[PDB]
């Protein structure tokens, strides 16, 4: 063990109800007792165990125990008193960022935290800024995320956005991945040319992916290269075809997206610089009437 992962007693956890389900397991809203002060709400991932093989759960627990920061989803500990194995995270009321975005999209149906309908520019910029900050932390630790996308971010009370997911994105958002052969799914629409062609993944590729996240944020969670097949999107990416500017996205933000989309990984801006630019724009949002 590389980190003293916290252990929660099974009695302290009360599963309220199921919030989602994947292949490796499912997510519950639950009531956890005696964590910080007093019966708080948490999100608990239960595994389905290939138990001896799914004991990489421990590794994920140690990593998540060490990988703690603002703008990264908070991890509290695990429970292994019996079956199934549980993993306890903080509850993020608005669910994943893509779901949130689509729920505030121009084409949707149906709050106390945020007005219904389209977000303002400052809000989109704030979301982007927060994701970018999470990435600044990760790059700082020489961590390569490898699946950066709104679906793998979570939105909490007061529009707090953090990087994080429960490992179900390949089940829930199967369309966002391209199946290669078998038992391997690639988020191609979010990947730079060097990840696709040369099969290399670095902090710079995460920068590209973040460009794509920006595009998602300004299209309210629409899929990149939608209406194109997987191979068609691949051809696009490897031929230097950029994503069009979203109608809600001002030119100054599209320039940032384009900054992230330099073909040569060394020519892309650092995640810190992108974060700074986005934070500045969020501090003084540019007028854009479309």
Known binder of ligand: residue 35?
Answer: no
227's torsion region: left (phi>0), alpha (psi -120 to 50) or beta? left
Cβ atoms of 98 and 173 closer than 8 Å: yes
Here the tokens at position 108 are 């949707």
Tell me the CA distances in angstroms from 113 to 147, 155, 158, 173, 244, one per residue in order: 28, 11, 6, 26, 31
Q: Could you tell me the CATH number of the domain that includes residue 153?
A: 1.10.510.10
Q: Is 21 annotated as a binding residue?
A: yes
Distance CA 234, CA 241 (A): 10
Q: Hey, what are 188's tokens?
A: 């191609």
> Looking at the 3D structure of the chain, how many domains does it have?
2
127 and 215 both lie in a single domain: yes
The residues, ordered by sequence, that sit 6+ positions from 22 with a Cβ below 8 Å of its Cβ are 166, 167, 168, 170, 171, 172
Q: Is 127 annotated as belonging to a binding site? A: no
- d(CA 263, CA 135) in angstroms, rounded, equals 20
User: Minimal CA–CA distance to 162: which of 113, 89, 111?
Assistant: 89
In-domain check, residue 289: no
On the question of a cis peptide bond just before residue 220, with omega within 30 degrees of 0, the verdict is no
To the question of whether residue 27 is assigned a binding role by annotation, the answer is yes
- Residue 263 domain-assigned? yes
112 is in an annotated binding site: no
Q: What are phi and psi of 272, to 5 degrees?
A: -65, -45
Separation between Cα atoms, residue 159 and residue 127, nearest integer Å: 8
Same domain, 64 and 113: no
| 172 in the same domain as 208 | yes
* Residue that terminates a domain, selected from 36, 60, 91: 91
Q: Which residue has the tokens 């991890």?
A: 75
Q: What are phi and psi of 239, to 5 degrees?
A: -100, 0
53 and 164 in a common domain: no
Going from the C-alpha of 196 to that of each of 26, 94, 187, 231, the distances in angstroms are 31, 32, 10, 11
Nearest to 273 by CA among 162, 113, 132: 132
Q: Is residue 36 part of a domain?
A: yes
User: How far is Cα 165 from Cα 66, in angstroms, rounded to an integer?
Assistant: 16
Closest CA to 82 of 18, 3, 1, 11: 11
Domain endpoint, select from 28, 63, 91:
91
Residue that terminates a domain, selected from 58, 91, 124? 91
Report the number of secondary-structure helices (H) and strands (E) in the chain: 9, 9
Q: 120 and 13: one domain?
A: no
Q: Where are the alpha helices (DSSP H) in the chain?
A: 57-66, 97-103, 121-140, 169-172, 193-196, 203-218, 230-239, 251-260, 271-283
Catalytic residue among 96, 147, 176, 206: 147
268 and 133, same domain (yes or no): yes
Is 286 part of a structural domain of the chain?
no
Residues 12 and 33: beta-carbon distance below 8 Å:
yes
Flag whether 233 is in a domain.
yes
- Indicate which technique resolved this structure: X-ray
Residues 230 and 134 in one domain: yes
For 59, the domain range is 1-91
Residues 83 and 196 grouped into a single domain: no
25 is in an annotated binding site: yes
The CA distance from 67 to 208, in Å, is 22
Q: Rounded to an integer, what distance in angstroms lies between the CA atom of residue 139 and that of residue 275?
A: 12
What pairing do the DSSP bridges indicate for beta strands 75-79 and 86-90?
antiparallel
Structure tokens at 243: 């994503």
- DSSP code of 2? -
**287 falls within a domain:** no
Q: Which two tokens stand for residue 270?
A: 């650092």
Q: Would you state the structure tokens that stand for residue 119, as one six-digit string?
A: 């977000």
Closest CA to 172 of 24, 273, 9: 24
- Three-point CA angle 121, 124, 129, nearest 5°: 120
Residue 280 in marked binding region: no
Q: How far apart are CA 273 and CA 130, in angstroms?
A: 14
CB 20 within 8 A of CB 95: no
**CA dist., res. 256 & res. 277, Å (int):** 8
Q: What is the resolution of this structure in A?
A: 2.4
Residue 147 annotated as catalytic? yes
Can you name the residues that pair with 46 across neighbouring β-strands? 26, 86
Same-domain status, 218 and 132: yes
In a domain, 290, yes or no: no
Pair 97, 231 in one domain: yes
- Say if CB 210 and CB 251 are below 8 A apart: no
What CATH number does residue 27 fall under?
A: 3.30.200.20
Q: Which of 271, 21, 283, 14 is nearest to 143 (CA)?
A: 271
What contacts 24+ positions apart, CB below 8 Å, involve 249-256?
A: 249/215, 249/218, 249/219, 250/121, 250/286, 250/288, 251/288, 252/281, 252/286, 253/125, 253/214, 253/218, 253/281, 256/211, 256/214
Question: Same structural domain for residues 129 and 42?
Answer: no
Are residues 174 and 49 located together in one domain of the fold?
Answer: no
């Amino acid at each position: 063990s590389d980190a003293c992962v916290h252990h929660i007693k099974r009695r302290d956890i009360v599963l309220k109800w199921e919030l989602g389900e994947g292949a490796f397991g499912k997510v519950f809203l639950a009531e956890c007792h005696n964590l910080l002060p007093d019966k708080m709400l948490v999100a608990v991932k239960a595994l389905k165990e290939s138990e001896s093989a799914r004991q990489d759960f421990q590794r994920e627990a140690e990593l998540l125990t060490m990988l703690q920061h603002q703008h990264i989803v908070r991890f509290f500990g695990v429970c292994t008193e019996g079956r199934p194995l549980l993993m306890v995270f903080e509850y993020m009321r608005h669910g994943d960022l893509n779901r949130f975005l689509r729920s505030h999209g121009p084409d949707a149906k149906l709050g106390e935290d945020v007005a219904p309908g389209p977000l303002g520019l400052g809000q989109l910029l704030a979301v982007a800024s927060q994701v970018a900050a999470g990435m600044v932390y990760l790059a700082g630790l020489h961590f390569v995320h490898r699946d950066l996308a709104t679906r793998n971010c979570l939105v909490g009370q007061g529009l707090v956005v953090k990087i994080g997911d429960f490992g179900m994105s390949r089940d829930i958002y199967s369309t966002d991945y391209y199946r290669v052969g078998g038992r391997t799914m690639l988020p191609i629409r979010w990947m730079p040319p060097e990840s696709i062609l040369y099969r290399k993944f670095t902090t710079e590729s995460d920068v590209w992916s973040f460009g794509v996240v920006l595009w998602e944020i300004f299209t309210y969670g629409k899929q990149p290269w939608y209406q194109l097949s997987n191979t068609e999107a691949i051809d696009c990416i490897t031929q230097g075809r950029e994503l069009e500017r979203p109608r809600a996205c001002p030119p100054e933000v599209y320039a940032i997206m384009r900054g992230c989309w330099q073909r040569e990984p060394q020519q892309r801006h650092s995640i810190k610089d992108v974060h700074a630019r986005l934070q500045a724009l969020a501090q003084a949002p540019p007028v854009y009437l479309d």
